[PDB]
Structure formats: structure tokens, C-alpha cells
Amino acid sequence: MKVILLEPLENLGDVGQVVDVKPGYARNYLLPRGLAVLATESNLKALEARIRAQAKRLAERKAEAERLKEILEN
RNA sequence: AAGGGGACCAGCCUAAACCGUCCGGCUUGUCCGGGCGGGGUCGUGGGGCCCUCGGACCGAAUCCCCAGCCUAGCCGAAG
Ligand SMILES: [Mg+2]
Ligand SMILES: [Mg+2]
Ligand SMILES: [Mg+2]
Ligand SMILES: [Mg+2]
Ligand SMILES: [Mg+2]
Ligand SMILES: [Mg+2]
Ligand SMILES: [Mg+2]
Ligand SMILES: [Mg+2]
Ligand SMILES: [Mg+2]
Ligand SMILES: [Mg+2]
Numbered sequence: 001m002k003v004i005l006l007e008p009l010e011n012l013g014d015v016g017q018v019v020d021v022k023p024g025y026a027r028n029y030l031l032p033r034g035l036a037v038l039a040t041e042s043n044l045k046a047l048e049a050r051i052r053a054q055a056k057r058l059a060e061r062k063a064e065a066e067r068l069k070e071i072l073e074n
Numbered sequence: 075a076a077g078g079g080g081a082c083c084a085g086c087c088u089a090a091a092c093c094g095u096c097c098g099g100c101u102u103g104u105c106c107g108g109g110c111g112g113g114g115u116c117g118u119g120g121g122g123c124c125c126u127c128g129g130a131c132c133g134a135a136u137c138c139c140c141a142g143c144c145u146a147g148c149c150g151a152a153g
Contacts, residue, residue: 006101042106042107043101043105043106043107045105045106046101046105046106047101049101049103049104049105049106050101050102050103050105052104053101053102053103053104053105
């Protein structure tokens with residue numbers, strides 16, 4: 001059963017990452033303890049969109065940073 | 075059972091794409107979701123979206139009116 005992890009998890013996987021595990025573990029451990037959610041399509045969009053936002057504001061930093069580089073140095 | 079002879083006869087509304095708006099969630103938006111509206115309904119495949127061109131006839135199974143009918147009756151030839 002595919003699920004997206006909410007936390008860095010011992011020898012299962014990384015925060016934000018999508019993994020495959022036996023149904024009961026998802027249903028009766030992970031999901032209730034809030035360490036993950038169903039890797040559904042509906043909130044696969046949510047993941048994919050935040051990935052976009054974190055990539056948006058980060059390289060946006062390197063943009064305004066590099067622009068202040070050019071002002072200075074000269 | 076198909077087929078043939080007949081009775082009767084009538085076909086429609088949605089879901090999804092996409093678009094709009096209200097609402098709440100927390101993981102703040104090109105977000106996910108739930109309402110309502112618009113769009114759409116097909117098998118010669120159909121629909122959405124994007125370009126070019128084209129710009130009144132139909133019509134209910136709903137509603138209203140009326141005939142007709144039902145729920146009392148009446149006229150009715152000639153010892
Ligand atoms: Mg027959
Ligand atoms: Mg027949
Ligand atoms: Mg008959
Ligand atoms: Mg929705
Ligand atoms: Mg919406
Ligand atoms: Mg909506
Ligand atoms: Mg087509
Ligand atoms: Mg109808
Ligand atoms: Mg009499
Ligand atoms: Mg008499």
C-alpha cells in the first residue's frame with residue numbers, strides 16, 4: 001500500500017517521500033500516529049504542488065541574492 | 075429463443091473533462107476537499123478544451139383553460 005510519509009522514518013524512508021508497505025501497517029500504525037497519509041491521487045497533487053512552492057521560493061532566493069551580488073562587487 | 079403476424083408506441087435526466095461561486099481544512103495556494111450553478115450525455119463513437127467559418131424552427135410525461143365523461147335527474151307515439 002503506497003503512502004506519503006510525513007516524517008523521517010527509520011529504515012522505511014524520507015519525509016515527503018512515497019513508499020509501499022503492507023496495508024495493516026499503513027492502516028493501523030502509520031496513519032493513526034500521523035506519520036503518513038494515503039498515497040492517493042487527490043493528495044498526490046498536494047505533495048506535488050508544495051514541491052513546486054518550495055522549489056519556487058528557493059530558487060527565487062538565489063535570484064534576488066544573485067541580483068544583489070551584481071549590484072555589489074561592482 | 076431468433077424470426078414472422080399483431081396491440082400499443084416515446085423517449086429522456088445525470089456522473090466525469092473544463093469553467094464559475096459560496097464554504098472549511100492546515101501542509102498557504104496554480105492546494106485538497108464539500109455545496110450550488112454553467113457545460114455534457116454518445117457507438118455513424120461522443121463530449122471538454124483551442125483555432126477558422128455559420129447565427130428561427132421544434133417542444134413536453136409539467137402547468138393552465140376547455141370539450142367529453144361520472145356522481146341526482148327529465149321529455150317520451152297510440153283504445
Ligand atoms: Mg417476438
Ligand atoms: Mg413482432
Ligand atoms: Mg387489442
Ligand atoms: Mg472538489
Ligand atoms: Mg475548487
Ligand atoms: Mg467546486
Ligand atoms: Mg473525439
Ligand atoms: Mg420529462
Ligand atoms: Mg313518461
Ligand atoms: Mg305511455
